[PDB]
DNA sequence: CTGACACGTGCCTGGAGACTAGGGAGTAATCCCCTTGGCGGTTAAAACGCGGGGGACAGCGCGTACGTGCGTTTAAGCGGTGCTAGAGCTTGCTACGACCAATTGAGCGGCCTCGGCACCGGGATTCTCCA
DNA sequence: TGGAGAATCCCGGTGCCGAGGCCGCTCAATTGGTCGTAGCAAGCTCTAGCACCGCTTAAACGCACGTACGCGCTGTCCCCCGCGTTTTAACCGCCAAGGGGATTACTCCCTAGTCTCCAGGCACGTGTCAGA
């Protein structure tokens, strides 16, 4: 009920920036889907970068350093 | 002569084993059927034709019977601890979906203990499953990992399958050096038969202290099957066109001869059946097919499977066939005092016309 | 001159599992540039590591970090376990 | 114009349910999850443009939950 | 004496390679004592991880040799090294026999 | 006489289980001379650098077809089209 | 010129190595111009590279970093 | 007395680029032209970026650089769309 | 430290009157980082390559090559070059 | 209308100016190997033709599921108060890694054998296909 | 199902050339020591991460509804597929030669290292007007 968070409202506000028209209505589950398991990706890697250094926050270039080893580079932190 | 009526002998005893495997096998063929659909871990679980397979090589009791169900494992590593090649114990491998086994585990080590528990827990499910069968489980007791199903028949009888992984990748390092049939069915019959899988039967060292249940010991049944059938360096030799050679049927003899004297003498229940069969396959790759394995001259065949037999005793070594490095009968393993008894035993029986096959 | 490959070592290794097998000479070659691209991958992410925390030593615990975050799932938890497998007996000698 | 599209409580909420299934206590700076909502949402952007296409193709207007595992399967993260 | 720094480890490859190949490529202005044995130890792991697969492979063609067409039916039968090495060409190894069941007849 | 699509089936089961290389070499040495005469002129290549171009340049072929059959099955038809490969290079970074 | 050295069959042999079971007849003339485009890309840099060794000869190896340069690694040619 | 920068004839620092190329763990020497050869080209792609995005918040009539116009000369240039493509920008919609 | 006093000088020259935020200044500096960071990288494989233990203008220059598309090299080069001439000179 | 950028001084910290030692990089000279070019013969593979049948494409119609608007409700966003974890820096010392000698077994190159494997030939099998 | 015609699988003999074993040797790893400074250990400041709470109100939710479009069905006709005959030019062996990559020996000049003098650049604080 967390990732629900993620409203319809949202992922129908994403797809109109991406160019869609019209869309269906079995695709907000897939999208959701899609948004966490990008998510875990990035947290893992920026967890095992926060151990590393031994803190407890997790920073900020942390993510951005998660972020770079996926290969999509993050500019503005 | 002496030698050819043991053999018929031996033959009886094989109707007596069909004795046997009219329940036996009545029983497993639609009791092993249960396994698969289970939806367990020791689901799959089927047996795998070795042993004797109706013949008198199991070496067992008269009324009794042995069977083995392979179970296939992923990724087996083999570890040997303070042993050398005798014992191993069971690790595992980076598995991508998880182990099927990953609650049978010690830590790392894979133990005898809670597979052969598990295992006669469905065992005794399914005996008191089916009814048409007249199948039972009797106790069991905490010296061997026998899961003994005792059968009642008009007259009593009794069964027992042991639980052997299967592991599908390379011989252990252990067996490098062994197996040497080169000379005698060709390195290439060696290099199509160390492709086979090889299985791992639980034993109990009972002689160390650290790990005692989880440990598991190298079984190479399925190769030796192998050889015992299609041996001879002729493809023909016992396959076709007549060409009796004569040496299973020393093998047969030799190994009643242990039998008998285990039976009649009490000590010699530290020596099984099995180190008769290392003495012969290190025998046979000594001397590959010979002039010397003709049906006659068979007392000269005795006369030399006795020599090699007193050889290996007098100097305190014999290699298994395909560990190399590992005295089946050594001081450590066996003290000296039951060996030079048995020495003097074979000595004796060599003389005065072999007194043992009298009373046969 | 003299080339150095790990031929000699990835046949070690290829002896303790599969004793009796070889390798074609040019499977070697793809073992060669396997051995040293992950070398380098592992290398390159501890180096970077090192410098994100303002250190100047590569040690062995940035060696773990590399391994955890390069390696994909399992592989990253079998891995750093015989890495520290050989640096406890290592100092113990 | 540029500004972001999820909600950042409910989103804030998402990450740290996230993060505990890998550390047991844990917390973020305040900048750690604005720039992984903020590459979050560029992601999926993305996935939708290249799944509008995947849905042309097919002589559709309507991507449905088919295309967009297209644009996935031939990216390479499935 | 003269004891080398792989055997106490344990180990195959070479822990006094590794360090100089650590020493001499531009990696850090320092190298720990457990940084070789750490990278050795995961370097054979691996190649020990690859080279059984690869074994078997070739083991149940029914040859005695591995050809890069063996390390290919090993790295993409596999989740974890497919994934390890999924933007990596394995010459001479071809491809993974699959075809849609769309086209099936 | 074969019905079409059967001798289709017949040797991607053949060229799948191979590992040959399935251009001529030849002709590839060639188009690679040709092509590099417009960044260097008079240049020399070693035979085991053609080989390696040819070994690189035919594996992206083989994923880019591995490619287009989705695209072309996605649309509910089996015959691959040009329209299918631009749109398998363009989710790619490609295009 | 060279570039019709890469003939229909062979394609087609491509094509099937990839799972395609029927082909349009504008594939080839497509095909044919997709791997130019991969090869300029390859041979552009290693040929950067070789002029930068101060060279004649393309290498395996400027070929191989090259090509690792594109994101695609190639085992089994050195490196 | 003269920094390296203005006998090179260049905003960014000569200095700190030798300093950042030394201490980063590149190569074991630095010659003396690569700071003035990397400055140059820094120097150069920024200020091709901010002639692009200068002239790019011109048509909106605002008279500052926000991310937002940033990302749309990105995107236009032909050029910088294929430099600084697989990027995401903060703000950037 | 930041190139954000130096990224100021140049936008003083390419832009007199136009100024530039904050945060758009932060991207300024993580761009300029990440080009930096990623010529530098590649001049260390290129004299890693011929086995060289030095990096020179003449690496530099080779990676820029190598990294820079199209006409985007073809400038910086001579932007490059021209420096170090103005360099060498004094 | 306010907070987000612009501009100003103290200063200290990192860059500029020498100087020297030595070792990496530039040059000249030889070696040999490996890239190119030619010759000539099978012969495997590309080119070409053509009949058809299985598939791309267009058309049409129903229906069900997507978009817009409206009344209501849930909870995000701003603020304000307030405390405690823990990020960030500092100061000791100490112990771990760099470096230089001298010794020495491991690993590379060269050499040489023969066993795995690629190829052939003729069953034997096992798909496909019209029916 | 039944079976004719084809591909594909397979197994007992060639024969060649590459995997692997071995040997001399050299150079790179190892042992033993010294030195100096990177990183741990401890202690402390105080930034900023969590936490609750109350009010406003933008935004999620739910329903109605009717129209746009997804999906099956049908037809038909371009255009690829499979097979056959014929052209061609790729593959192979073989030899020659010369261009160029590789190796070695001075040698010099270019970068690292060190000491010191100080101006460029960061931080803290104040003071506006672009524009959310
Ligand atoms: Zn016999």
Not at chain 2, 30 to 54: A, C, D, H, I, P
Not at chain 5, 59 to 77: E, F, G, W
């Given at each position: 009920?967390?990732?629900?968070?993620?409203?319809?409202?949202?992922?129908?506000?994403?797809?109109?920036?991406?160019?869609?028209?019209?869309?269906?209505?079995?695709?907000?589950?897939?999208?959701?889907?899609?948004?966490?398991?990008?998510?875990?990706?990035?947290?893992?890697?920026?967890?095992?970068?926060?151990?590393?250094?031994?803190?407890?926050?997790?920073?900020?270039?942390?993510?951005?350093?998660?972020?770079?080893?996926?290969?999509?580079?993050?500019?503005?932190? | 002569?002496?030698?050819?009526?043991?053999?018929?002998?031996?033959?009886?005893?094989?109707?007596?084993?069909?004795?046997?495997?009219?329940?036996?096998?009545?029983?497993?063929?639609?009791?092993?059927?249960?396994?698969?659909?289970?939806?367990?871990?020791?689901?799959?679980?089927?047996?795998?034709?070795?042993?004797?397979?109706?013949?008198?090589?199991?070496?067992?009791?008269?009324?009794?019977?042995?069977?083995?169900?392979?179970?296939?494992?992923?990724?087996?590593?083999?570890?040997?601890?303070?042993?050398?090649?005798?014992?191993?114990?069971?690790?595992?491998?980076?598995?991508?979906?998880?182990?099927?086994?990953?609650?049978?585990?010690?830590?790392?080590?894979?133990?005898?203990?809670?597979?052969?528990?598990?295992?006669?827990?469905?065992?005794?499910?399914?005996?008191?499953?089916?009814?048409?069968?007249?199948?039972?489980?009797?106790?069991?007791?905490?010296?061997?990992?026998?899961?003994?199903?005792?059968?009642?028949?008009?007259?009593?009888?009794?069964?027992?399958?042991?639980?052997?992984?299967?592991?599908?990748?390379?011989?252990?390092?252990?067996?490098?050096?062994?197996?040497?049939?080169?000379?005698?069915?060709?390195?290439?019959?060696?290099?199509?038969?160390?492709?086979?899988?090889?299985?791992?039967?639980?034993?109990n060292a009972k002689d160390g202290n650290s790990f005692q249940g989880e440990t598991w010991r190298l079984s190479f049944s399925h190769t030796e099957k192998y050889i015992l059938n299609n041996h001879g360096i002729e493809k023909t030799c016992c396959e076709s066109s007549g060409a009796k050679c004569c040496r299973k049927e020393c093998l047969k003899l030799?190994?009643?001869?242990?039998?008998?004297?285990?039976?009649?003498?009490?000590?010699?229940?530290?020596?099984?059946?099995?180190?008769?069969?290392?003495?012969?396959?290190?025998?046979?790759?000594?001397?590959?097919?010979?002039?010397?394995?003709?049906?006659?001259?068979?007392?000269?065949?005795?006369?030399?499977?006795?020599?090699?037999?007193?050889?290996?005793?007098?100097?305190?070594?014999?290699?298994?066939?395909?560990?190399?490095?590992?005295?089946?009968?050594?001081?450590?393993?066996?003290?000296?005092?039951?060996?030079?008894?048995?020495?003097?035993?074979?000595?004796?029986?060599?003389?005065?016309?072999?007194?043992?096959?009298?009373?046969? | 001159?003299?080339?150095?490959?790990?031929?000699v070592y990835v046949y070690k290794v290829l002896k303790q599992v599969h004793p009796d097998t070889g390798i074609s000479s040019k499977a070697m070659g793809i073992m060669n540039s396997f051995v040293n691209d992950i070398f380098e991958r592992i290398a390159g992410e501890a180096s970077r590591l090192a410098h994100y925390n303002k250190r100047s030593t590569?040690?062995?615990?940035?060696?773990?970090?590399?391994?955890?975050?390069?390696?994909?799932?399992?592989?990253?938890?079998?891995?750093?376990?015989?890495?520290?497998?050989?640096?406890?007996?290592?100092?113990?000698? | 114009?540029?500004?972001?599209?999820?909600?950042?409580?409910?989103?804030?909420?998402?990450?740290?349910?996230?993060?505990?299934?890998?550390?047991?206590?844990?917390?973020?700076?305040?900048?750690?999850?604005?720039?992984?909502?903020?590459?979050?949402?560029?992601?999926?952007?993305?996935?939708?443009?290249?799944?509008?296409?995947?849905?042309?193709?097919?002589?559709?207007?309507?991507?449905?939950?088919?295309?967009?595992?297209?644009?996935?399967?031939?990216?390479?993260?499935? | 004496?003269?004891?080398?720094?792989?055997?106490?480890?344990?180990?195959?490859?070479?822990?006094?390679?590794?360090?100089?190949?650590?020493?001499?490529?531009?990696?850090?202005?320092?190298?720990?004592?457990?940084?070789?044995?750490?990278?050795?130890?995961?370097?054979?792991?691996?190649?020990?991880?690859?080279?059984?697969?690869?074994?078997?492979?070739?083991?149940?063609?029914?040859?005695?040799?591995?050809?890069?067409?063996?390390?290919?039916?090993?790295?993409?039968?596999?989740?974890?090294?497919?994934?390890?090495?999924?933007?990596?060409?394995?010459?001479?190894?071809?491809?993974?026999?699959?075809?849609?069941?769309?086209?099936?007849?």
């Open positions: 009920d967390n990732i629900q968070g993620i409203t319809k409202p949202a992922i129908r506000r994403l797809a109109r920036r991406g160019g869609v028209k019209r869309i269906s209505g079995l695709i907000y589950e897939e999208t959701r889907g899609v948004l966490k398991v990008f998510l875990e990706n990035v947290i893992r890697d920026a967890v095992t970068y926060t151990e590393h250094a031994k803190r407890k926050t997790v920073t900020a270039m942390d993510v951005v350093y998660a972020l770079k080893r996926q290969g999509r580079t993050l500019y503005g932190f | 002569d002496k030698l050819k009526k043991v053999l018929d002998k031996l033959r009886l005893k094989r109707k007596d084993i069909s004795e046997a495997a009219e329940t036996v096998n009545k029983v497993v063929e639609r009791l092993l059927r249960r396994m698969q659909k289970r939806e367990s871990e020791f689901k799959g679980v089927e047996q795998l034709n070795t042993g004797s397979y109706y013949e008198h090589v199991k070496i067992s009791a008269p009324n009794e019977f042995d069977v083995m169900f392979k179970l296939e494992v992923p990724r087996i590593e083999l570890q040997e601890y303070y042993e050398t090649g005798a014992f191993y114990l069971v690790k595992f491998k980076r598995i991508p979906r998880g182990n099927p086994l990953s609650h049978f585990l010690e830590g790392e080590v894979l133990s005898a203990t809670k597979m052969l528990s598990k295992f006669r827990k469905i065992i005794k499910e399914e005996v008191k499953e089916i009814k048409d069968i007249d199948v039972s489980v009797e106790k069991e007791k905490p010296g061997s990992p026998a899961v003994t199903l005792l059968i009642r028949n008009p007259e009593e009888i009794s069964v027992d399958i042991i639980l052997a992984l299967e592991s599908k990748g390379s011989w252990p390092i252990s067996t490098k050096e062994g197996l040497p049939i080169q000379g005698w069915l060709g390195t290439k019959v060696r290099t199509n038969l160390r492709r086979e899988p090889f299985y791992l039967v639980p034993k030799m190994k009643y001869l242990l039998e008998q004297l285990k039976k009649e003498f009490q000590e010699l229940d530290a020596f099984c059946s099995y180190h008769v069969k290392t003495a012969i396959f290190h025998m046979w790759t000594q001397d590959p097919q010979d002039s010397q394995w003709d049906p006659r001259n068979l007392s000269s065949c005795f006369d030399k499977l006795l020599a090699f037999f007193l050889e290996c005793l007098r100097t305190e070594k014999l290699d298994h066939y395909f560990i190399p490095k590992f005295n089946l009968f050594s001081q450590e393993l066996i003290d000296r005092k039951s060996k030079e008894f048995l020495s003097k035993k074979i000595e004796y029986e060599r003389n005065n016309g072999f007194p043992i096959f009298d009373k046969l | 001159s003299r080339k150095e490959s790990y031929s590569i040690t062995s615990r940035e060696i773990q970090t590399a391994v955890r975050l390069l390696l994909p799932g399992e592989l990253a938890k079998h891995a750093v376990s015989e890495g520290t497998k050989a640096v406890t007996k290592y100092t113990s000698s | 114009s540029t500004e972001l599209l999820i909600r950042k409580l409910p989103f804030q909420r998402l990450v740290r349910e996230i993060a505990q299934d890998f550390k047991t206590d844990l917390r973020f700076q305040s900048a750690a999850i604005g720039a992984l909502q903020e590459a979050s949402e560029a992601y999926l952007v993305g996935l939708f443009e290249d799944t509008n296409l995947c849905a042309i193709h097919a002589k559709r207007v309507t991507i449905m939950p088919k295309d967009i595992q297209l644009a996935r399967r031939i990216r390479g993260e499935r | 004496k003269a004891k080398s720094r792989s055997s106490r480890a344990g180990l195959q490859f070479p822990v006094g390679r590794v360090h100089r190949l650590l020493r001499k490529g531009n990696y850090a202005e320092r190298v720990g004592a457990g940084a070789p044995v750490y990278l050795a130890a995961v370097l054979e792991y691996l190649t020990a991880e690859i080279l059984e697969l690869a074994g078997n492979a070739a083991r149940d063609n029914k040859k005695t040799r591995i050809i890069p067409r063996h390390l290919q039916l090993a790295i993409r039968n596999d989740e974890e090294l497919n994934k390890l090495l999924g933007r990596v060409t394995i010459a001479q190894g071809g491809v993974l026999p699959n075809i849609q069941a769309v086209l099936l007849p």
